[PDB]
Design a protein around this ligand. Structure first.
Ligand code: NAD
Ligand code: NAD
Ligand code: NAD
Ligand code: NAD
Ligand code: 1GP
Lengths: 330, 334, 330, 330
């Protein structure tokens, strides 16, 4: 059983935690945030997006008790002081958003852990892995990244589309839910001025390297995709709107057939396929990181098409983080 | 001295009356069988999106009285029964969403209207987007016209500038669109659009448009070269078009930016606008333009494959254009 | 086993349906609305608030198949034409909002039903029943009402407080989630002008009979309670805020103990109790019609107190409709 | 004119600034925040809630220029290092939220300013003034507080009702817009666990001092009012719900008469009165700190009533901050 330690118990850390409960191959043996253990329990117990926690949580001697299982709680601002080895943590899930470089993340290995998974795209050359795209390329690196939730939606779709028909070029938009970084009313964000504007009131243009990043986990698609985002007032679930030019002409039904073949075979559990009249809330809790929406899409012609695919940016991503942890331990 | 009658006192019809108050266009009558004078006052005086009406609104002797200007209130179900003749044969703004064919909107002509503007796409009435093809209006042959959709009025002025300058070989549009009156507060019945009955406030809802095809009608060279779709999202007003196109002539994003600025400053002033500021949707709440280009929100893959972004207040910009078009129609009377 | 027909497959109709699947005493045999069978299947399968239906659903020969049981689907606008006898229905859940008098509800009996439960306050002297207050005053009547969601939250709390301390007088406010009668953008509501204004933009004052209605189910409190609502931009879950003058002096601990003992005692399943830091999404899916919020309430002195109770206006009420159905069929 | 300096260009600072431009007695000469001059210009020009700045804004060189007038831009964390005198500031509007004691607020005085108005309730013995309540008890103090937005609503109404009918006792609920302190999705809020929960998703119970603080600005009411808040998913405008026991019997018509008389008389422009079917967005931009809603309220009897009053938490308070500046420097 792979022991894991979550650093940062925010949205991802918490939903990764809930997702690990249903796995046999992984134990979450420790958590580090900047919160008292009782507050950490409260945040685990109750969730505005995902309902109440299925199971028991208790606090004794400053340690969480979750379904009879002790979890070490710490509050070390500096990942250097974490003593990961006094709990036997094999891998740490880096979920604070702060340590997305080798140098910063490597402190976990210095503090006792063996390997690290960053729960965001790396800010340096830390290699990125996306299930159904390039998990098999992993070479034993002790520090990795699961890229972003959007790359986790886009890449599996793009692989199938490229593998069957050939993407000459593609431009992507993600209509994306509100995230922690945003502001409830017009506030400061000197990094990102639009991003400070009240999240409940606005459609907010936003930039992303999610489409570029696909060409890293799929090198054959390098230089061929790029894109952007609009943040909208939903608390969870997002959607990719990919417009691609194809080398081989394909009817919309041919494209449907291809994705459905992959979703049922090669990409099962990663890429999903629907023909129902679905909306965002229908995918709250979706574990598949990309779910093709057959009826949403549209073809101008056999060689030019807008494709649509859904993802629960919280749940799907958190699940593949555990899949990445699992894979690098194999 | 155009005189306008409004049929249907909803979002478009109330806001059309507002823009008419703002421009001194005389609205002589409003017909709505489901809103009485007292209730029209309340719906016009207070607005959740565009705020309180700046001015006075009262009711007197079964008339709506806005800034001391008396407006007759009718309560008829059918266009052909409305007393347009009794209020001086105005041009009628057909804003119900129910009489969309030439045959349907012509009832107003039977009952004394001089012209009709349908405030939505028509299956047969001529579309006329100001800045693009309003000169197609033939006063000699057209008594019923369509001012297209809100989305079409955003896409077309942009699409014109880009086609003329660079050539659009092909394009796919998405509009990320505010919710409207047709949607539901919680999951409910919408027989003809299952997704559109799901709660407007909880959901991103994939939706249909013929706005990009409609551009092929008002700009005939773009016929068969644009299509698209929509996502309805939890905002009460202001929408945005996301146009992904292949250009015939290579164009840097700076060349594109300069072409749009040009049009905005000259031939499409008041219709097409240009911004480089870090704007968001509420920044165009109450904006009069049909299309506000967002220079910094867009992205080019290369000189021939770009994604363009333009904003539009789907309520208030579109109302402004209804009033623009009927003033334009009135100027053309022989 | 009790056979039920649902008239009106809206929010209450569809949630009553789901809840009935989790009971063995009651089976839904028939459904009436102005909708096709395949559209009903869709509205059942997917719910923005309560997630995907737990189980199977299909349409076959113009009827529903839900967890393998055939549900009759009809589309009659007039209840008299409903032929409930052809499906052998015992009780009709009348949840259209249109038939809330004896006169109109009785068309279901004309149509072959034994009894009718109205899923709203009755608009005449048709008797009203709220579980925890007066179920046991059911005297064999063939048409009854389960009152409102708000009364079902208030009645149990009121009864507990009155029985222990004596309510001299009380005023109540409910901060209520948006419902189906509201409008997305400012539109016509000629019976309630405020209620026509954009639901998601506004705090909207509303009238409610819920507090007077408590006087009907608990006659001892007749003339002693009234109140009103504010509708707010949330899709589900509502809250009662009861300000009461107490005859007998009571510490907030003593008030807490009273509710807690009623919660665990004679009002188990109806009245709930908590001392956690709860918000409204924490009661999404709650079966109790009233969950006392201990920390949220506040006393000025031992004889003047503000009490708060949560309720899921959809789920809790719907469960109690099935409870009322099961009671009147005992 | 009175030269004002703003510390903290947040929601209040920005609305104070905009309201300052309509005044002939007051000129804002400097703002201090952790913001670039270009970013302050952006935040002033564009506003999600209150629309575009009515006026000209430029950054020349530069150098914030608004309506032709130069505004000094500083980024000093420590108020003691502000040199307010170097631009000639008499009164400083302290609107960061962080300096609400005499100790901290007095750093502006040593940085060269003459007086200080805190734009929030003082966390020490610092005196609080609310217009229509106790502005005339100002006795030349050099550091004062303007109370809270909620206290500015309730106190005016409380005094009218006390003066005419006498409050034995009251309990208060504010149904309140979301603020900058809340989170877009469930996030850390260690001093207020409920307040960390998704702002857009939830009705959030919240504790407020504003009802007790009425006792400070109206000593005749000390220990007679307390209350609480429900934060709800609206970006501006809140409402007070005052349940009161009255000494002297009073018809709702007499309550109305009194509220209206005071609104047209001694509390003109502070206390407002409406009989229209108003909702929250109708008071967006409201200058009156308390607007009485005749039709929203309800009486059980002539001694027990529920009174409803609206306020634009942002706009009205910002206007009364400016009134307090004008008054203390008379
Ligand atoms: N939110 C999503 O849907 C999503 C999806 C995929 C990836 N991600 C990525 O995952 C990362 C975290 O995302 P999130 O949404 O959970 O953000 P979040 O704000 O919810 O989580 C950050 C958490 O880390 C804690 N923290 C801050 N500094 C710390 C430190 N010094 N030591 C320990 N803990 C600290 C905070 O208390 C907070 O709870 C980010 O890199 C984000 O981009 C987010
Ligand atoms: N809302 C937008 O963003 C927008 C923008 C562009 C075009 N439009 C178009 O304008 C039309 C109306 O849209 P809206 O948003 O104002 O709708 P709305 O629902 O707000 O208003 C429709 C109004 O028509 C009235 N009405 C219904 N039947 C009538 C009849 N038989 N006679 C007279 N009045 C009647 C109703 O009372 C209602 O007030 C639609 O065709 C729509 O597509 C709307
Ligand atoms: N939703 C709540 O929180 C709640 C709580 C308690 C009580 N109620 C009550 O339940 C009743 C229904 O409320 P709802 O929220 O389900 O509304 P809803 O709009 O979701 O349900 C009404 C349904 O009835 C159908 N309908 C309309 N006319 C019909 C006809 N004549 N024959 C058959 N079906 C018809 C509609 O298609 C719709 O599906 C109302 O009386 C309401 O007051 C609702
Ligand atoms: N917004 C309301 O509804 C409201 C109503 C009444 C009172 N208030 C009070 O107003 C004050 C500010 O609240 P707000 O709502 O404007 O929140 P806000 O977040 O919008 O304002 C805080 C601002 O102060 C700035 N700031 C932080 N540290 C600073 C530093 N040390 N030096 C200079 N600037 C700094 C921030 O950049 C931010 O712009 C609070 O005390 C609050 O209690 C707010
Ligand atoms: O959906 P409706 O109400 O027609 O809205 C019109 C326009 O906003 C786009 O269609």
């Amino acid at each position: 059983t792979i022991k894991v330690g979550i650093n940062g118990f925010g949205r991802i850390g918490r939903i990764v935690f809930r997702a690990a409960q249903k796995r046999s191959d992984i134990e979450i043996v420790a958590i580090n945030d900047l919160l008292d253990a009782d507050y950490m329990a409260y945040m685990l117990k109750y969730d505005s997006t995902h309902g109440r926690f299925d199971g028991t949580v208790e606090v004794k001697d400053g340690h969480l008790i979750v379904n009879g299982k002790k979890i070490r709680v710490t509050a070390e601002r500096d990942p250097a002081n974490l003593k990961w080895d006094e709990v036997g943590v094999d891998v740490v899930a880096e979920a604070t958003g702060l340590f997305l470089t080798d140098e910063t993340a490597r402190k976990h290995i210095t503090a006792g852990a063996k390997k690290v998974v960053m729960t965001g795209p790396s800010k340096d050359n830390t290699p990125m892995f996306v299930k159904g795209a390039n998990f098999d390329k992993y070479a034993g690196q002790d520090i990795v990244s699961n890229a972003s939730c959007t790359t986790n939606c886009l890449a599996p779709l793009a692989k199938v589309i490229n593998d069957n028909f050939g993407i000459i070029e593609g431009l992507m938009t993600t209509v994306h839910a509100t995230t922690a970084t945003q502001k409830t009313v017009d506030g400061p964000s000197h990094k990102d001025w639009r991003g400070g504007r009240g999240a409940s009131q606005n459609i907010i243009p936003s930039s992303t390297g999610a489409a570029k990043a696909v060409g890293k986990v799929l090198p054959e698609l390098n230089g061929k995709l790029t894109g952007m985002a609009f943040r909208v007032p939903t608390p969870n679930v997002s959607v990719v709107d990919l417009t691609v030019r194809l080398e081989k002409a394909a009817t919309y039904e041919q494209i449907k057939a291809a994705v459905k073949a992959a979703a049922e075979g090669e990409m099962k559990g990663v890429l999903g396929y629907t023909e129902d009249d679905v909306v965002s809330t229908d995918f709250n809790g979706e574990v598949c990181t990309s779910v093709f929406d057959a009826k949403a899409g549209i073809a101008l012609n056999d060689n030019f098409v807008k494709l649509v695919s859904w993802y629960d940016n919280e749940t799907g991503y958190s699940n593949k983080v555990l899949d990445l942890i699992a894979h690098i331990s194999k | 001295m155009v005189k306008v009658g409004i049929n249907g006192f909803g979002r478009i019809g109330r806001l059309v009356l507002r823009v008419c108050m703002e421009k001194g266009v005389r609205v002589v009558a409003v017909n709505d069988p489901f809103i009485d004078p007292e209730y029209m006052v309340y719906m016009f005086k207070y607005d959740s999106t565009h705020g309180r009406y700046k001015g006075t609104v009262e009711h007197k002797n079964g008339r709506l009285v806005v800034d001391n200007l008396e407006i007759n209130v009718f309560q008829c179900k059918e266009p052909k029964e409305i007393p347009w003749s009794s209020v001086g044969n105005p041009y009628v703004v057909e804003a119900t969403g129910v009489y969309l064919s030439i045959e349907a909107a012509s009832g107003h002509i039977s009952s004394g209207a001089r012209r009709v503007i349908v405030t939505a796409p028509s299956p047969d009435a001529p579309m006329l987007v100001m800045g693009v093809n309003e000169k197609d209006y033939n006063p000699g042959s057209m008594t019923v016209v369509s001012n297209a959709s809100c989305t079409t009025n955003c896409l077309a002025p942009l699409a014109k500038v880009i086609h003329e300058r660079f050539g659009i070989v092909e394009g796919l549009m998405t509009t990320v669109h505010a919710y409207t009156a047709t949607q539901k507060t919680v999951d409910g019945p919408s027989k003809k659009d299952w997704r559109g009955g799901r709660g407007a406030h909880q959901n991103i809802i994939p939706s249909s448009t013929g706005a990009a095809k409609a551009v092929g009608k008002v700009i005939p060279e773009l016929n068969g070269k644009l299509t698209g779709m929509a996502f309805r999202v939890p905002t009460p007003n202001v929408s945005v078009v996301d146009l992904t196109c292949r250009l015939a002539q290579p164009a840097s994003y700076t060349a594109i930016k300069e072409a749009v600025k040009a049009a905005a400053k000259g031939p499409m002033a008041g219709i097409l606008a240009y911004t480089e500021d870090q704007v968001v949707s509420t920044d165009f709440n109450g904006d009069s333009h049909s299309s506000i280009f967002d220079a910094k929100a867009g992205i080019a893959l290369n000189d021939n494959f770009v994604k363009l972004v333009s904003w539009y207040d789907n309520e208030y910009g579109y109302s402004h254009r209804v009033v623009d078009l009927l003033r334009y129609m009135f100027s053309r009377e022989k």
